[PDB]
Design a protein around this nucleic acid. Structure first.
Ligand SMILES: [Mg+2]
Ligand SMILES: [Mg+2]
Ligand SMILES: [Mg+2]
Ligand SMILES: [Mg+2]
Ligand SMILES: [Mg+2]
Ligand SMILES: [Mg+2]
Lengths: 141, 185, 131, 58, 125
RNA sequence: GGUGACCACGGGUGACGGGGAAUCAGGGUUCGAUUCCGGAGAGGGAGCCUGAGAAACGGCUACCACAUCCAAGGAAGGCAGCAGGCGCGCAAAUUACCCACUCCCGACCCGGGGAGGUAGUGACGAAAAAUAACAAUACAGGACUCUUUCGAGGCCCUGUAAUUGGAAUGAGUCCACUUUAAAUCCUUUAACGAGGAUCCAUUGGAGGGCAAGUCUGGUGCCAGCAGCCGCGGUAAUUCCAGCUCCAA
């Protein structure tokens, strides 16, 4: 069973803080190593410079290619790939532009049929990405 | 380094479960028959009701004869009758618990003028409040959520600068007068 | 003037400041905020005082117009008024002259004489050429 | 790469361009909260429709 | 209406809000028949169908407006075949769908009058 | 000798501590750099004078790092103050006015105070709160309904919603006043100022959870959507569009 003596709080707190490490949610938050491995490093958005327009195929229940772009982050300039959501946003962006990459939406996990991509591209060179698709504001040509 | 206050709070709460069939129309019943602008006001009144319910629950679970229970017991009660949501002859706190939301809105100045008949068509009642034709005992107020105390229930009348109490007909009355005086002689 | 009236409340006298402290209110139903000037003699004529030692300010009108409250200050003589009274109101109706350089050039000038040491001729000369 | 990303935005290209035609501006504020309340709450039409819509086309 | 003024009159007390069949959903083609009487009824086994004259009114309509059957369906937001059914003559006519074609076509096939020079007045009176 | 499984010692802290903030059955879990209190620092260390009080840095001395002028002989530095630049980054304002208020300092009614206050920028955020109302016109369409057509109302849809159709108003121009150290703003108040009152409300959705389309046209496992189940290869309730509805 579990100890219940009134002069026991040392056993309970030590045990509860011991087993507290055994769930994914708390361990990831407190270990710190996940924070180092996170390409954003605790940030919600990150500016980057595009390197390569790529297409990545779907999962088996689907059949398509997903138009992503590889990007170097400005700080700690590692490279990630970020799917860019819309029909024609690819023709809107070209090589080597400033893009405001943000997370996909489920805390650094792949979304749906896209394999291994955890980021979505918004805010290409400072004009917003959504503004282009609606045509609200145009390219700084 | 700063002489300000920063003392503020949210007067309303968001419902926990959005997109419920029962809650949506019941709320819509309230705004439609009370001429409210949005469901925020319906949430604003329910949040105030929840607070006075919460305090009254606290008072009740506190034991009888405790000085604070009595003192706040009259304090809450004596102010509720002052609002008029409670009847003067009921001095029992648990009748706050049975008290419902739709009568707090009955204390709004928007609905009081309609029941008093000074402003028919309660939607028309609220606008003329914003139009600043309705004047409290000694003052002109444009607040559709104004809650009238019992002491000032009877003193709701049209303002003197409005073109329903004193004179000065409004600007459309003026324009049609001069275009009339110019087209005729 | 046909329909404008003055009432005074919270009136207490003090020879500490050789005046009487009191707050006015004005009913001007269909009028704008009444200028301070025609107030000044209006409380003078019903206080049988000189309508030139009269100090009034702080006039904000309640919502919907009409009632407007504010603070008045009636003295005994201009001399006692001048001795104990903020200068900014005396600037409103001009009795105390007020025209100086902005605080910027004061600071620029002040740091200038702080540079020049001792010599009164150049301490005062720091504004002749460096003006 | 496959070069198969040239098909980006095809269905937007092939979508025929039809335009938003002139309609009456809808009421806003409390007024918007007026008309739908009257439309859906006090109304007794004597027909069937299996609890169809306030735009009822059964 | 009549009690609507009376409902405002009953400001002090009373008054009921009963909702209705409506309040929120969309279905986008008005089944005109009761289907309550239809379930109840036993004798009648015949539908009136659509009469060919109104099919002609459609013909003069789109011909005057320069619409082939495909185009005017996109206006009405129904399949192009229901137009041909309405023109050909089977079509099992439906009140609002005729009304939709009544609005798109200048003429009025809806109602007792077979054809109107204008539907409900030029620029609606 | 002293401490230590009642966790000493060591290490990490993306740790300044507390008053408190968020969430709210109770319990608890997170956040507290940030205006109040306490501590620490003035590029990093170190050392001093004066002084009641400093190991002071809008004081000095030396070393290190940066870095200014120079007649190359030397001299001068400390914005983690107010502003304002660069850099950094997803991320944060004007090199404005004033000592009038709050108080501080001094020999002192009298001077000074980027403390502070005022303004500007400011969808951090919170409170209130416009985008229309009234009445009549009425008239039609609809399985309308009640007599079986004629008439009316116990009804829905839109449409003249139109000379309606003239009453009421702000949003903005804008008289003065007011306010204020002087201004600004708000509040007063004239003159204007509304019938698509075109003076125009958007943001996301319409298979499920989850309110709302077995509408249409394009596309054809393509483009794409989709938090997650899943949708998409010709007849897509999910993409791209038009119409209509839902939500705030
Ligand atoms: Mg902190
Ligand atoms: Mg401090
Ligand atoms: Mg120090
Ligand atoms: Mg030091
Ligand atoms: Mg508007
Ligand atoms: Mg839809």
């Amino acid at each position: 069973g579990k100890c219940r003596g009134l002069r026991t709080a040392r056993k309970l707190r030590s045990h509860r803080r011991d087993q507290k490490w055994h769930d994914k949610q708390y361990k990831k938050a407190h270990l710190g190593t996940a924070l180092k491995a996170n390409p954003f490093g605790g940030a919600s958005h990150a500016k980057g410079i595009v390197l390569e327009k790529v297409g990545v195929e779907a999962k088996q229940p689907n059949s398509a290619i997903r138009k992503c772009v590889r990007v170097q982050l400005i700080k700690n300039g590692k490279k990630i790939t970020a799917f860019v959501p819309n029909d024609g946003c690819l023709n809107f962006i070209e090589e080597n532009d400033e893009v405001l990459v943000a997370g996909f939406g489920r805390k650094g996990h792949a979304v749906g049929d896209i394999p291994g991509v955890r980021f979505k591209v918004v805010k290409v060179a400072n004009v917003s990405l959504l503004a282009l698709y609606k045509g609200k504001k145009e390219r700084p040509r | 380094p700063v002489a300000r206050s920063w003392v503020c709070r949210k007067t309303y709460v968001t419902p926990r479960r959005p997109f419920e069939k029962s809650r949506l129309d019941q709320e819509l019943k309230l705004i439609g028959e009370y001429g409210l602008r949005n469901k925020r006001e319906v949430w604003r009144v329910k949040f105030t009701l929840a607070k006075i319910r919460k305090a009254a629950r606290e008072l009740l679970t506190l034991d009888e004869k405790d000085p604070r229970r009595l003192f706040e017991g009259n304090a809450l009660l004596r102010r509720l009758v002052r609002i008029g949501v409670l009847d003067e002859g009921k001095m029992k706190l648990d009748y706050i618990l049975g008290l419902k939301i739709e009568d707090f809105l009955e204390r709004r100045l928007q609905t009081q003028v309609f029941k008093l008949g000074l402003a028919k068509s309660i939607h028309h009642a609220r606008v003329l409040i914003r139009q600043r034709h309705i004047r409290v005992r000694k003052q002109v107020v444009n607040i559709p959520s104004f809650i009238v105390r019992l002491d000032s229930q009877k003193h709701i009348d049209f303002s003197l600068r409005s073109p329903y109490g004193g004179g000065r007909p409004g600007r459309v009355k003026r324009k049609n007068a001069k275009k009339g005086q110019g087209g005729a002689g | 003037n046909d329909t404008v009236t003055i009432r005074t409340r919270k009136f207490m006298t003090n020879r500490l400041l050789q005046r009487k402290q009191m707050v006015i209110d004005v009913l001007h139903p269909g009028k704008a905020t009444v200028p301070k000037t025609e107030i000044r003699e209006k409380l003078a004529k019903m206080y049988k005082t000189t309508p030139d030692v009269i100090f009034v300010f702080g006039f904000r009108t309640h919502f919907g117009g009409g009632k407007t409250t504010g603070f008045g200050m009636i003295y005994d003589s201009l001399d006692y008024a001048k001795k104990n009274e903020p200068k900014h109101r005396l600037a409103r109706h001009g009795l105390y002259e007020k025209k100086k350089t902005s605080r910027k050039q004061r600071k620029e000038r002040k740091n200038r004489m702080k540079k020049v040491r001792g010599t009164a001729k150049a301490n005062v000369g720091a504004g002749k050429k460096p003006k | 790469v496959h070069g198969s990303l040239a098909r980006a935005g095809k269905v937007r290209g092939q979508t025929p361009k039809v335009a938003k035609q002139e309609k009456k501006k809808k009421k806003t504020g409390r007024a918007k909260r007026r008309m739908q309340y009257n439309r859906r709450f006090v109304n007794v039409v004597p027909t069937f429709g299996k609890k169809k819509g306030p735009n009822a086309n059964s | 209406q009549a009690i609507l003024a009376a409902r405002r009159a009953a400001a002090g007390e009373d008054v009921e809000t009963s909702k209705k069949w409506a309040a929120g959903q969309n279905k986008q083609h008005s089944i005109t028949k009761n289907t309550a009487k239809l379930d109840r009824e036993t004798e009648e086994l015949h539908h009136d169908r659509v009469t060919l004259e109104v099919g002609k009114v459609i013909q003069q309509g789109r011909q005057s407006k320069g619409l082939t059957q495909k185009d005017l369906a996109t206006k009405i937001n129904e399949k192009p075949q229901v137009i041909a059914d309405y023109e050909s003559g089977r079509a099992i006519p439906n009140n609002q769908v005729l009304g939709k074609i009544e609005r798109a076509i200048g003429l009025k096939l809806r109602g007792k009058d077979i054809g109107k020079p204008i539907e409900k007045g030029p620029r609606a009176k």
